[PDB]
Amino acid sequence: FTVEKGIYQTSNFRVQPTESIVRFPNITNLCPFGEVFNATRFASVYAWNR
Amino acid sequence: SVLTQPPSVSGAPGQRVTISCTGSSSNIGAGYDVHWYQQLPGTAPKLLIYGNSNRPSGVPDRFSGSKSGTSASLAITGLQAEDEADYYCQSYDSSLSGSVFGGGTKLTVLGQPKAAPSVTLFPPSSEELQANKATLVCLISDFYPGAVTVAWKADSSPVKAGVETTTPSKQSNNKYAASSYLSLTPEQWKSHRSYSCQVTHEGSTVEKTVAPT
Numbered sequence: 001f002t003v004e005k006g007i008y009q010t011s012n013f014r015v016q017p018t019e020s021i022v023r024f025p026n027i028t029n030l031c032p033f034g035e036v037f038n039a040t041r042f043a044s045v046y047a048w049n050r
Numbered sequence: 051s052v053l054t055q056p057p058s059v060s061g062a063p064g065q066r067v068t069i070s071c072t073g074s075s076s077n078i079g080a081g082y083d084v085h086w087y088q089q090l091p092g093t094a095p096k097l098l099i100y101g102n103s104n105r106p107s108g109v110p111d112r113f114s115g116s117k118s119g120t121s122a123s124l125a126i127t128g129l130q131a132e133d134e135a136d137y138y139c140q141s142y143d144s145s146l147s148g149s150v151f152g153g154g155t156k157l158t159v160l161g162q163p164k165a166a167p168s169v170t171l172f173p174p175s176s177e178e179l180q181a182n183k184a185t186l187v188c189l190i191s192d193f194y195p196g197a198v199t200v201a202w203k204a205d206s207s208p209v210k211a212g213v214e215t216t217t218p219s220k221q222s223n224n225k226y227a228a229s230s231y232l233s234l235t236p237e238q239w240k241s242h243r244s245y246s247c248q249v250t251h252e253g254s255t256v257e258k259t260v261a262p263t
């Protein structure tokens with residue numbers, strides 16, 4: 001209950017982060033799929049492109 | 051193009067022969083059915099099996115068709131005397147917006163034992179000299195199989211221009227005959243001392259020579 005003059009260490013200071021970044025790439029690769037829509041002509045409804 | 055097939059397959063008369071066909075995920079692996087056809091060299095192809103589940107009329111049960119997901123397979127049991135044709139894969143392609151066929155597999159092993167060839171050399175006649183051309187023919191007859199290489203020499207250097215070789219055809223007595231022409235001109239025909247044809251069959255080489263003068 002009595003403290004004299006001097007230096008004293010009580011606890012420690014920790015800076016806890018508040019946000020996290022977990023993104024690995026800047027962008028991913030693609031595969032050719034726009035040719036289904038960007039095509040010269042389409043198919044019919046009795047025989048459609050699969 | 052999009053469908054690849056092996057060039058040839060080997061088998062035995064009495065064992066199971068199975069062919070494997072591989073395409074893409076948009077024509078055969080997408081869910082479309084496949085159809086197999088036989089391309090006989092000389093007659094129009096006909097239907098063998100459609101959908102790999104139904105048997106068309108006039109087709110034996112010996113052919114079996116299955117689709118192992120992306121790849122389709124055809125299996126046969128025993129080799130008879132009409133399988134000397136080509137097998138193709140036909141399926142609907144969404145990317146091509148139409149039907150595309152396969153490559154084709156040849157089904158043969160060996161049917162050609164050896165024989166003894168004989169050649170003859172005939173110089174051009176007198177009426178051929180005024181046509182401003184010289185057709186040198188060295189006929190080959192009574193040989194088996196029809197796989198003969200043809201070489202032309204003028205006793206000082208081989209001739210590598212105008213050399214041709216015709217495909218052989220079956221004779222009356224199950225042999226083969228062939229001919230080889232050589233396009234030249236009468237201007238240098240008389241200058242050369244002699245002309246000849248040289249052929250080689252299973253290591254047997256025969257030579258016949260003519261003299262224009």
Ligand SMILES: *[C@@H]1O[C@H](CO)[C@@H](O)[C@H](O)[C@H]1NC(C)=O
Nearest residue numbers: 032033034035036037038039
């Ligand atoms: C189709 O083409 C247009 C213009 O050429 C383009 O803007 C678009 O990204 C392409 N792909 C699709 C799926 O529309």
